[PDB]
Paper text:
The spherical cowpea chlorotic mottle virus (CCMV, diameter d = 28 nm) is one of the most studied viruses. Its 180 capsid protein (CP) copies are arranged into 20 hexamers and 12 pentamers, resulting in a quasi-icosahedral T = 3 symmetry. Due to the CPs’ innate protein assembly pathways, reassembly results in the formation of hexagonal sheets, empty spheres and tubes.
After characterizing the starting materials (dimensions are given as average (avg) ± s.d. throughout), 6HB (davg = 6.1 ± 0.6 nm) and intact CCMV (davg = 26.8 ± 1.0 nm) with negative-stain transmission electron microscopy (TEM), the complexation of isolated CPs and 6HB was performed at physiological conditions (pH 7.3, 150 mM NaCl) using the CPs in excess. Negative-stain TEM images and small-angle X-ray scattering (SAXS) for samples complexed at ε = 2k (6HB-2k) reveal 6HB complexes with increased diameter due to a highly ordered protein shell (bottom), which develops from nucleation sites along the origami structure (ε < 2k). N-termini facing the origami create a positive electrostatic potential surface for the inner surface of the protein tube (bottom right). For the outer tube surface, in contrast, the negative electrostatic potential is predominant (top right), hence allowing the formation of protein multilayer complexes. The cryo-EM densities of CPs encapsulating 6HB clearly show large holes between the hexameric units, resembling the swollen state, which is expected according to the solution conditions used.
Numbering used by the authors:
A (entry chain F), B (entry chain B), C (entry chain A), D (entry chain D), E (entry chain E), F (entry chain C), ...: 1 to 147
The structure:
Amino acid sequence: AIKAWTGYSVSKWTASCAAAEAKVTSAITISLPNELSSERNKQLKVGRVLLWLGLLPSVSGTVKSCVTETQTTAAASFQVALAVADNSKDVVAAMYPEAFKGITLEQLAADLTIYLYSSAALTEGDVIVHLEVEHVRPTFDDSFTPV
Amino acid sequence: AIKAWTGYSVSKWTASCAAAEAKVTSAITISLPNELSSERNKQLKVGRVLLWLGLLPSVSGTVKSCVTETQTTAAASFQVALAVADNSKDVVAAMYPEAFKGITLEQLAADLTIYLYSSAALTEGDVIVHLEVEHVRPTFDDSFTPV
Amino acid sequence: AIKAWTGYSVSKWTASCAAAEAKVTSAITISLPNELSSERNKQLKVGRVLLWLGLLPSVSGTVKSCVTETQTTAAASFQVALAVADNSKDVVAAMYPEAFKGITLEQLAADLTIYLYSSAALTEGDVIVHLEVEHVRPTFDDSFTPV
Amino acid sequence: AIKAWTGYSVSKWTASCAAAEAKVTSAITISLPNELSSERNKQLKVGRVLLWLGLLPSVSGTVKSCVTETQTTAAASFQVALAVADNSKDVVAAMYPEAFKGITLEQLAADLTIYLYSSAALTEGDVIVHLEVEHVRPTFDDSFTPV
Amino acid sequence: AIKAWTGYSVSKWTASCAAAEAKVTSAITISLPNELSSERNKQLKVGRVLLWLGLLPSVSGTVKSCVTETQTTAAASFQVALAVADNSKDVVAAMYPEAFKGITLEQLAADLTIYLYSSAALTEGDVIVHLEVEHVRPTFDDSFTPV
Amino acid sequence: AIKAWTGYSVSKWTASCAAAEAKVTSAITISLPNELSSERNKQLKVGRVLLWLGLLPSVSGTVKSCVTETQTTAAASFQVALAVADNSKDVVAAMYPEAFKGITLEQLAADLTIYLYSSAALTEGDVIVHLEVEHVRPTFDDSFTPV
Amino acid sequence: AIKAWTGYSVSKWTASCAAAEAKVTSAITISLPNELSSERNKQLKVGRVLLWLGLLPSVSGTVKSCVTETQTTAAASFQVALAVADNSKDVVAAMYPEAFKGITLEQLAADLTIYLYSSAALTEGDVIVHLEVEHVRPTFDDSFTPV
C-alpha cells in the first residue's frame, strides 16, 4: 500500500448519503474528526486527499463522486473535478493527489465538499462515502506547565 | 520546566468546582479530552500525573485537593493521598509523580477521581482545577487503505 | 503538472456548446481575449495546444472532440485531426505537442476550430470545452498617452 | 511621453458617462479587466495614476473631473481631490501621481471612484473618461499538472 | 512636490466655514490636529506654512484667503498678509514660507488666524480650507520606565 | 532600563479606578492617548506591553492587577492572566511581554482590558494604574500636497 | 514522437476507400505524392513505413487495414500481413517498421498495396487511410547549367 511522507500522517472517517431521487446530484459536507477538532490541529497543512467509495450490492445504476471546491449548483461540480470515482471502473477510487497541497485543514472543513450522483434512486445509507486525508503530523506539548 | 520521557507526551485540560458549603468535601470527575477520546488512544499507559490549583483572589480560607482511587465517603479520600495540593504553601501544586505508572488511560477516566475541600464556602467556578497527564505518545496510521 | 518553456506563458478560455440532436457534429469558434487582442500581442507564436473536456454526469453516451483546420463538412474533421479527446478514455484529454508550432496567434483565432460529437442528444451547458494555449509572454504598454 | 518605472507596467480602460442635468455632479465606477482580475494579480501595488478627459466639441461650458476616495455626497468630492482635470485649461489632464502609491489594485477597484461635473446638460456619450494605471508587471499561468 | 528639511516633518488638516453674506470677510480659527494636541508636541517649532484652497464647483464668485497675525477687524488683514491664495490665479495656493520660521506650534494655535473672503454669498461647506504645516519632527520615549 | 526594538517606539498613559467595596474586582478600559488616536496610527502593531502600578501610601490592603482578554465576570480574569502585578512583591511590575506580539493597536483599544483587585475598600484615585506600550513607530508625511 | 534517421526524411499523403457491402475486403492503390513523382526521386529507398487510420464517428463496425505485397484475393492479405491496424485496439496505428527496409520507392508504388476490411457496410469517404513513409532525403541540383 501507499505510504505517507516523513513528517506527514494519516487519518480516516465517514459519512452516509442522504436519500434522493434518481438523476439528482446530492451534496455531502466534510466534518472533521474529534482527534483533530482542537484549535491546535486545524492549522495543519493537507498533503494528499483520497476519496474512496463502497456500496451495498442492490444499488444497480451508475454511481459517481468527486471532491471539488463548492460549486453554486451541485450537479455542475464534476466539470472541475481533477478525477472522478466511478462504479463502472474495476476499482472505485479517485486519488488526486496534487489537488490540495498547502491548503489549511480548516479550509478542507470550510469549503471543499463532496458530491454524489446516481442514475437510480437511493435510500439513506445505501452508499457509504469513505474519505482519507494525509497531512502534517499532529504534535502534543513535550512538557508540563511550570509549577 | 520538567520534560516528559522519550516516547511519552504531555496533555492538559480543566474542570470547575460546583458550589459547596464550608467544611464539606466535593467530588470532581475526570473526563478525557477529545484529542484522546478514540478507542485507539484510551488503551495507552499513564506515566505521571500532576494535580495543580489556581484560584480567584477573594477566596479566603484553606483550600486542599488530591487525586486518589474513589473513596466511598468523599472526605476520607485524603487519607490515602500520596501528596496534597494546598493553598497554604507558596506553590500550590502537588507532583506525585509515579503513583500511577502502567495504569490504563481509560482507568484514569474510570475510577481515579479528584477531591476538593475548603474551610470556607465556595460559589460556582471560584476554583479552577487544572490537571496535567503525561502518557505514551499517541500514534496515527502511517498509510492509506488498499484501493 | 506540465510547465511551459523558458519565456513562454499560458492562457485559458472557455466555451459551452449549443443543443444538438444525436450523432450531429457541432462547431465551436475561438475568440481572443482582450489582453492578447492588441496589435502588439497578436503577432506571438503558438508553442503547444491542449484540448480538455468535462461534462455533467447525466451525459450517457460517447462524447468526442478535436482541433483541426476548418473543414467544409464538419463531421469529417476528426479524419484530419492529429488526436482526439474521447470520454471512453480514463482521462478525457488530447494534447497536440506538435501540430500548431510556429502558427501565429491570429491564425489560431482565424481558422483553427473546435469540433464536438455525441452519440446521444445534448442541451445547453451539458458539455464544457476548455482550451489551453502556450506562447511567448505577452507585454503591456510601458508609458501613458503622450503629447 | 512619460514612461513607467523599471519593472512597472501600464494598463488602460474606458468609461462613457450617463446623461445629467446642468451642474449636477455624477459618479463613474472602476471595474478590473479579466487579466488583472486574477487572484494572482489583484494584490499588486499601484505606482502612479493619471486621469485624462476628452469631449466632442458641442459641449459648451466648463467640464471638471477628479479622482478621490468615495464621498457620501458626490458634489463634495472635488474638495478632497489632490488635483482636478478641467477643460478651462489648455490640456485637459490631471496627473497626480502621489495620491495612491502603495494602494492595492483591488482597493483601486473597490473604493477609489471618479466624479464628473458640467456647467451645461449632457447626453449619453458626450464625454469619454480615460484612466491610466501603473503597477508592477502582472504574470500568467505557466505550468503542468501532476498525475 | 516640495519636501521638508531633514529633521522636519509634514502634517495636514481641515477646516470648514460657516455661511456668510456677499462681500463679508470671515475668520477661521485654527485648532491643532489630535496627533499633535499633547503637551509634549505643542512646543515644537514651525519651518514653513502652505495655505491651500478648494471649493465645490457651483461657487461662482471670487474667493480669497490668507494667513496673518490676528487683526482687530477681519477685512483689513489682506492688506497685511505676505501673500494671498486666490481662485482667480492659475494655482489657488500660497506658499509663504518665510513668515513663520521659528514660531512655536502653540503660537500657530494661539494668534495666527485664517481669513476668508468671497464676492458672493456662501453656505456651510461650500468652501473648504486646507492647511499644511512643516515642523520639527515629533518624538516619543525610547525607553520603558524603571520597574 | 529596557529599550524598544529598532522601528518600535514607547508611549505611556494613565487610568484611575473608581471606588469599590472590599474584595470586589473591578475593570479598567484602555482608552488610547491622543497622540495615537488618528486613523493613520490605529493600524500599527504592538511589540510588548508593560503593566505597572503605584498607590498613595495609606492604602492598607493587598492590591493586584493584570491585563487579559475581557472576561464575563471580572474576578475570573486573574485565572487566565499570563502574569500578575502585585503590591506584595519586592517590585510590583509584571512585564509580559509575549502576550500581544503582532496584535493591532486598535485591538489593544477594543477587547484587551485591565483588571484590578483589592482586599480592602478603595476610594476614587487611591490607586493609579499606569500602563506602558511598545509598538511600531508612528510616522508623518514627508511632503506637502501638489499646489 | 518518433523521428527519421539522419539522411532520411518524412512524407505523408492520403487515400479514400470506395463504398462496399459488409464483410467485403477492399484494396487501395498507393499513388505517390506529387513532391516525389519525378524520375530523380523514384529511385530513392524506403527506411520505415507507418500505417495509420481514422474514421468519421458514425461508423459502427470494426475496421481493419494493413500493408502487404499484392494478393490474389484481397481478404487473404491479413494472413500474410506482418502487423494490422485496428479500430478496436487502444491505438489503431501499426508501425511495421522492418517490412520494407531498402525497397525502392518505385516498388512501393508498384506492388505493395493497402487492404481494408469492415464488419459493416461503408460509403465513400467514411474511412480515410492516411499513410506515412520515411525514406532517403530528396535532393535538388546545387548549380545552374553552363551558359
